[PDB]
Swiss-Prot record:
Main location: cytoplasm
One Pfam family matching this protein: Globin
Protein's cellular compartments: Cytoplasm, Sarcoplasm
GO cellular component assignments: sarcoplasm
Coiled-coil annotated residue ranges, if any: none
Lineage: Eukaryota, Metazoa, Chordata, Craniata, Vertebrata
Organism expressing this protein natively: Equus caballus (Horse)
Protein name, per record: Myoglobin
Amino acid sequence: GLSDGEWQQVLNVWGKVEADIAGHGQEVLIRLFTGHPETLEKFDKFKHLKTEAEMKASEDLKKHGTVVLTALGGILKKKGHHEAELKPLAQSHATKHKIPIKYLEFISDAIIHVLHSKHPGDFGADAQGAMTKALELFRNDIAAKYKELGFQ
Ligand code: HEM
Ligand SMILES: O=N[O-]
């Protein structure tokens, strides 16, 4: 788990995301899709996006970015007490969307990259430690649900 201090850092960092949820969301998905094109194939509604320019110009991608980070933000604000929030996401992502846990690793890494990219010099070593711990906890709890379902 995370310490109280670590949770406070996580939620302080998240303040940055909340000032521009769509912009952060868009950049996270673009980072995911460009670094790992196989992930784009999981989205029927985005696999028409051939180029990063098309991704950047896609208002629906920005919209989905907002949905994703809003969901994650709600989870983070539970400070690990997130069973009710996490269970349905784990189940939809395993059973409906067929998203291997590796792709959740990819998007976790994308979040860290985007935070540094948008806030260079303002995402300190302690902050990166705390956010990484929160993202791992999220991933690990999803993985438990994936194992239950025998997914991958
Ligand atoms: C931070 C981690 C993630 C969060 C919080 C998240 C959140 C969400 C939410 C709230 C939805 C809509 C409700 C639902 O279907 O459950 C959704 C849909 C979806 N997610 Fe995720 N997601 C994450 C990671 C991923 C990753 C890495 C992929 C890889 C491709 C993915 C693929 C999809 C797909 C294909 C849909 C359905 C889109 C549609 O039908 O239009 N998700 N996600
Ligand atoms: O973008 N993940 O839903």
